[PDB]
Design a protein around this nucleic acid. Structure first.
Lengths: 196, 79, 62, 174, 141, 42, 203, 108, 190
RNA sequence: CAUCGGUUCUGGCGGGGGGAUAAAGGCCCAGGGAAUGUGGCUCCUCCGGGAGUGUUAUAGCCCUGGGUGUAAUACCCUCGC
RNA sequence: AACGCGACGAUACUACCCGCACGUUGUAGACGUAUAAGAAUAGGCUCCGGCCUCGUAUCCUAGCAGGCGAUUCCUCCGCCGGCCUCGAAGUGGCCGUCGGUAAUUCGCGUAUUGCAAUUUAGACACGCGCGGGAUCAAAUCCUUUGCAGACGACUUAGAUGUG
């Protein structure tokens, strides 16, 4: 798969503009300022041309959407932005759908439903540098074993004259990317509901 | 067998020098032993070997038999 | 025990997918797509209708 | 085995006081040259008549040319060949234009089909089959058939091995 | 019953079939030795087409469209020459496209440097005429 | 129509001929004469 | 024998090892080679023999660490042909690396090679080499069975390229017709002395 | 104006030194002449001068272009490859580089 | 040994049209049209006589000569299929649990479908999708009988084989348990 | 570059000798013979061709002897340019 | 893939783009570095007449390394612009202006590089120059955070704020 082109909306919020910066507080905040002029130049001819290119050449269409992190209690102000695939319909239908969805808020209950089983993707809890006993679940050596007991006694007893990639070693534990499946939605509660 | 999907460890055709030398030594010793056994062989052997004869599919076998008969008649007449 | 990769288990799961879970997920998809549709609706060169060109190599340099 | 010729080789035992006029022995030898022909003559004479090269002499060596090298002939060859089992009879047929060509075809045939080398083959008789009814083998009988005519399907064309690249895919129909 | 068969029609090696050898000479098949060799005779009076009577391997020969009718199997050089001259093998061979291609090749390989220059200039004049004709044709439709 | 039974039951199968690829090389009368000559030689 | 800027070879119907031998000799002589349609290359013998050979190849791996040093098994057809070519080149020398830099291999016919003349090698052509009745397989099929992911994408792109080539061939037929009519019309307007002079010269 | 070329030489490629399996001898080079594919065709080019033309870094006596001269000595093999002897042995990096086979000394 | 010329012949009925192009054989009769690609076999097709197809092999081995017999039988079976057709009669028998056979025709695919229920009291429903061109009916002249008919003998017989193989008794003594569906008759429709 | 010397590789040309004074072969002469039997004749057909009879006829072939002929050519050896 | 690739945003300067002005600048190696059907190979191609071993082909190819002026021709080539078209790693077609142009023929010039010596001539990339057009950006240290952490690294926040 190859990304052929992407089309942005005319107005981007400051929370999603913060994603393109490391030092937003010092910045001139110039991102997408020349891109926004394409909507006014020649009645958006370049925008229309890129949309037509997507319509006639592309097989997969995704939207670009970002969180509104300012509505959370988090101290972070830089929002999270990702590509969400539009499934269903024809390619022209997907393009018209995404363009109609430009600059609009999409709530969770228009995407998922109660009693639906979904998947959750996130990075796990970090643990730092961890020995083999807690990193791999190996058996502890007996008490007052020389050179330590939270170890594997023989990391190699056999040929090759090497350490093999299948032997448990101390190292980073946690902060791993995991995709977990089959999680049931019990409730989609509404924020404006005082008894959710 | 599941040879195509899961082949096993290959059988090497690359010879080693040790095995080549051992096989050459054993072949030479077998040749000498066979010569000694042929020298000491007590099995009976004919003085004259059995002849296969003339093949039946040879189209002039009857004419060859005629020629043999006339030659032996001439030899008996001369002797 | 039959494995998760067993052909009979796969066929049973395919029949379950076709006959039981499929209509339920199709109805849920219809409802969700209706809601998100409600949210969504709530010269060629000079116009962009003709798709002109935008404003290591596969060949040897020649 | 090689560009063979047929030689009439006539030899004899050396004359003595008891035998002032010894018998002359004649052989037809297929050989690449006269030295090989005389060597094969003395080999066969040692195998048959107990006449040795040291006590003998060569009287004549002549080349026997084919009488009609432009006439297609069928040849029957009776030979004996030596394998690990022993000595085996064989009758074979060859469609050639000369006895020498038939003998070379026989040597190539024996080497290809039975791994018989030159020194293990004894040619006993080479005959020209006088009539079509004298042909026994089906691979010659199909060739002597009346009104014989065949095409040549799937002929790979002769392309020079130095011309690596061709601009058109070749055909196999001529 | 209607049968419609679209397959090949090879030329057949047979008694009387004329072969073209690699040097350009012609021969007629007198007798078939086996599936790889024939006996052939070229009695042509033209020295470029003549071939002595002898064995021809079929891998070194090509099958021409000419077949001498009713040539007897095993016929000697006199009878083959009489049938060849009666049929007129040389004229039909000259009319074939293989001999025209060979004649064109010979004429092109015989060219000198002045001949090549004259070929260039005459071809440019003719090509000027065909370019005008092509412009006239393309303008019409 | 067919009057006999085929053993495997495939009744549509044609009345096959013997597989003799060398058929037609030698006539019957020549083979008879060769039979007599071979018997005399033996 | 001829020297070209770049030789584009159509890989369809070519035997893998013989084409690789000829290509490697050309590369070491100093000729640039682009092989297209590597999925249509042929291997002599039955398909299961090629499958068995590739699974025997897949067996081999560096035991202590599969991420380094080991035989890395490339499943794309152009990479299978590239392994065949690389085995016949001293690729661990600078001269061998320079000879390998003169070669490009692709699945299908990517542009701009769809509008270039594609040559064939008669010494490696399956119809000219293999005996009739012998079995043969296809490198694209072997690749698809051992895990190459883009058999259908290349098939659709090849179908599109062949449709465009059909339109181009219709235009080419029209141009050839018009050229024949132009030569026939102009044959009266050339000087006759020019015409027999060219005819006697052989043109 | 003129639309022709100006080539008066035959193209060739430098393939290898004279060598066996292992030992190479740089005093003789193997040249593949374009369009020459047998010993009979290669016999025409015996004695013809051949230049290897290459580029250096500094300008010396008005040019950045240097030449190594040699002559074709004898045919090699059966496929029209020829042996050539140059004033100095050709550089090892020029295996696969181009050389110019002149039409002089001419015997036509 | 290589045989110079070998030949087979196929008679063609007067109501049959045979077209062969690049070893692709199309046979048309009163009952329809059948096609078969024989490009895997080297053979020269010709018209030796009116209503006779000639097949030949030049310079072939014994195996290549023998393959023409298989080609002859294949083309003859296609001719018989387009003239008379092929019919397989199957019988389903049971001891205690009556086997229920339901035959439908899928409108989306055009193929027949056979559903088998209560095979030795099993609760699963067996489904066999028939080959295209194969018509399946439940007989009314006899008891517990299916009739499969078509132009392609291979399709009809493979469909019958699929029906036979789907109803297989497992882990039981087959001397004692005799339930199943079996091919009981083979013949022509006409 | 020309004219030479030494060594060497390679291409072409003119002669001589030998053998069965090559064997063949062409064109004549005189005999003999046969089929994978030409013409003719007879009998069947799908009218395309088959089958039979018999020795050159409206094709030809094979074997022997002779003449041209000390023919040519191949192969081997050899004298030169 | 830390020496595989794509899309996009903003890009201060000596940075970027355009025109020409050249390189003691480089490059596994220009010298006509010309040429798109697909498919079969026990069959194909076609202008529908016929044709197919064969790229031994076709195109192009003359002039100071190619001048000047005619005679003559409307053929070929190139840059720009318009409209279409081309996504497998994106480029061709038509029309128009302008410039060049032996298909025919001729005049004036070529010498002297001294009897050969790469025929210094192509393409891409890089750099130094002007003359114009276009644009006013970020990152890191630091302070901070604890979704992180041996140290680096990572998630954050720091410019007026829902800080």
């Amino acid at each position: 798969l190859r990304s052929l082109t992407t089309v942005w909306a005319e107005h981007l919020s400051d929370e999603v503009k913060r994603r393109f910066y490391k030092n937003w507080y010092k910045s001139k905040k110039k991102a997408f300022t020349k891109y926004a002029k394409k909507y006014a130049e020649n009645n958006g001819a370049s925008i229309t041309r890129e949309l037509e290119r997507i319509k006639k050449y592309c097989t997969v269409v995704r939207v670009l959407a970002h969180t509104q992190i300012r509505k959370t209690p988090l101290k972070q102000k830089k929002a999270h932005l990702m590509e969400i695939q539009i499934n269903g319909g024809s390619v022209a239908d997907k393009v018209e759908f995404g363009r109609s969805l430009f600059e609009k808020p999409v709530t969770i209950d228009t995407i998922f439903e109660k009693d639906e089983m979904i998947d959750v993707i996130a990075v796990t809890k970090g643990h730092g540098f961890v020995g083999v006993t807690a990193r791999w679940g190996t058996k502890k050596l007996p008490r007052k074993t020389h050179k330590g007991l939270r170890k594997v006694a023989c990391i190699g007893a056999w040929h090759p004259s090497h350490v093999q990639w299948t032997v448990a070693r101390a190292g980073q534990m946690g902060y791993h990317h995991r995709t977990s499946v089959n999680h049931k939605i019990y409730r989609i509660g509404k924020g404006d509901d005082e008894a959710n | 067998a599941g040879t195509i999907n899961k082949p096993k460890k290959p059988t090497s055709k690359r010879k080693t020098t040790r095995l080549r030398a051992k096989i050459s030594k054993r072949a030479a010793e077998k040749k000498r032993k066979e010569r000694k056994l042929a020298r000491k062989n007590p099995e009976w052997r004919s003085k004259l070997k059995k002849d296969p004869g003339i093949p039946n599919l040879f189209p002039y076998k009857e004419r060859l038999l005629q020629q043999i008969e006339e030659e032996r008649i001439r030899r008996k007449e001369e002797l | 025990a039959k494995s998760a990769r067993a052909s009979r288990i796969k066929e049973n799961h395919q029949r379950f997918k076709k006959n039981i879970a499929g209509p339920v997920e199709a109805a849920r998809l219809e409802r969700l797509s209706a809601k998100l549709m409600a949210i969504a609706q709530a010269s060629g060169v000079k116009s962009g209708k003709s798709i002109g060109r935008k404003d290591s190599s596969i060949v040897f340099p020649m | 085995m090689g560009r063979l010729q047929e030689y009439q080789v006539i030899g004899r035992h050396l004359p003595t006081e008891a035998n002032p006029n010894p018998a002359l022995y004649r052989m037809r030898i297929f050989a690449p040259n006269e030295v090989v022909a005389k060597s094969r003559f003395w080999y066969f004479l040692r195998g048959l008549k107990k006449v040795k090269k040291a006590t003998g002499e060569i009287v004549s060596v002549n080349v026997i040319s084919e009488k009609h090298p432009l006439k297609v002939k069928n040849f029957g060859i009776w030979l004996r060949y030596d394998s690990r089992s022993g000595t085996h009879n064989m009758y074979k047929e060859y469609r050639e234009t000369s006895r020498v060509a038939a003998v070379e075809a026989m040597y190539a045939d024996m080497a290809a089909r039975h791994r018989a080398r030159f020194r293990s083959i004894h040619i006993l008789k080479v005959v020209e089959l006088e009539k079509t009814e004298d042909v026994k083998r089906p691979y010659i009988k199909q060739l002597v058939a009346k009104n014989l005519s065949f095409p040549l399907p799937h002929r790979v064309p002769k392309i020079s091995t130095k011309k690596i690249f061709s601009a058109k895919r070749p055909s196999t129909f001529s | 019953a209607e049968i419609n068969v679209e397959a090949t029609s090879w030329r057949r090696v047979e008694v009387g079939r004329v072969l073209k050898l690699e040097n350009g000479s012609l021969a007629a098949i007198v007798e078939i030795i086996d599936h790889k060799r024939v006996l052939a005779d070229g009695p042509s009076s033209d020295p470029k087409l003549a071939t002595p009577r002898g064995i021809v391997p079929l891998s070194r020969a090509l099958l021409t469209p000419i077949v001498i009718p009713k040539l007897p199997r095993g016929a000697r050089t006199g009878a083959v020459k009489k049938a060849w001259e009666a049929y007129g093998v040389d004229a039909k061979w000259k009319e074939t496209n293989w001999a025209k291609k060979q004649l064109q090749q010979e004429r092109r390989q015989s060219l000198t440097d002045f001949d090549r220059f004259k070929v260039m200039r005459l071809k440019k004049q003719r090509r000027f005429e065909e370019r005008k004709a092509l412009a006239k044709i393309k303008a019409a439709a | 129509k067919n009057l006999g039974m085929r053993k495997n039951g495939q009744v549509w199968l044609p009345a096959k001929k013997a597989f003799r690829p060398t058929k037609g090389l030698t006539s019957w009368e020549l083979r008879v004469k060769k039979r007599q000559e071979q018997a005399a030689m033996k | 024998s001829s020297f070209e800027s770049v030789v584009v070879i159509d890989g369809k119907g070519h035997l893998l090892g013989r084409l690789a031998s000829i290509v490697a000799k050309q590369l070491l002589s100093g000729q640039k080679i682009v092989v297209v349609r590597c999925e249509a290359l042929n291997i002599s013998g039955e398909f299961f023999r090629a499958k068995l050979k590739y699974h025997a190849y897949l067996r081999k791996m560096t035991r202590y660490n599969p991420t380094r040093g080991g035989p890395f098994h490339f499943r794309a057809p152009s990479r299978i042909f590239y392994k065949a070519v690389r085995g016949m080149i001293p690729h661990k020398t600078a001269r061998g690396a320079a000879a390998l830099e003169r070669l490009k291999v692709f699945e299908g016919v990517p542009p701009p090679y769809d509008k270039k003349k594609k040559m064939v090698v008669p010494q490696a052509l399956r119809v000219l080499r293999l005996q009739p009745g012998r079995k043969y397989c296809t490198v694209g099929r072997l690749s698809h069975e051992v895990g190459w992911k883009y058999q259908d994408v290349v098939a659709r792109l090849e179908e599109r390229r062949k449709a465009k080539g059909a339109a181009y061939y219709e235009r080419k037929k029209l141009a050839a017709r018009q050229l024949s009519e132009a030569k026939k019309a102009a044959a009266a307007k050339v000087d006759p002395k020019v015409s027999e002079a060219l005819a006697a010269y052989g043109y | 104006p003129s639309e022709a070329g100006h080539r008066l030489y035959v193209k060739g490629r430098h393939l290898s030194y004279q060598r066996g399996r292992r030992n190479t001898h740089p005093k003789t080079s193997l040249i593949k002449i374009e369009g020459v594919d047998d010993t009979a065709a290669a016999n025409f080019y015996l004695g013809k001068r051949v230049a290897y033309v290459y580029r250096a870094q500094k300008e010396v006596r008005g040019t950045k272009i240097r030449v190594i001269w040699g002559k074709i000595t004898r045919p090699h093999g059966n496929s029209g490859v020829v042996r050539a002897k140059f004033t100095h042995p050709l550089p090892a990096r020029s295996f696969g580089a181009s050389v110019r086979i002149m039409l002089y000394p001419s015997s036509i | 040994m290589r045989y110079i010329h070998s030949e087979e012949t196929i008679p063609v009925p007067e109501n049959v049209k045979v077209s062969i192009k690049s070893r692709l054989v199309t046979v048309e009769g009163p009952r329809g049209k059948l096609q078969k690609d024989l490009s895997h076999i080297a053979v020269n097709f010709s018209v030796v006589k009116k209503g006779v197809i000639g097949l030949e092999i030049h310079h072939g081995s014994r195996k290549d000569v023998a393959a023409l017999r298989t080609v002859r039988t294949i083309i003859n079976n296609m001719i018989i299929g387009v003239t008379k057709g092929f019919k397989y009669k199957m019988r389903y028998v049971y001891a205690h649990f009556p086997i229920n056979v339901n035959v439908e025709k899928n409108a989306e695919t055009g193929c027949y479908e056979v559903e088998i229920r209560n095979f030795i009291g099993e609760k699963i429903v067996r489904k066999v999708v028939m080959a295209p061109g194969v018509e399946v009916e439940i007989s009314k002249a006899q008891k517990d009988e299916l009739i499969l008919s078509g132009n392609s003998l291979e399709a009809v017989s493979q469909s019958a084989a699929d029906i036979q193989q789907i109803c297989k008794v497992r882990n039981k003594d087959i001397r004692k348990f005799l339930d199943g569906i079996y091919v009981s008759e083979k013949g022509n429709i006409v």
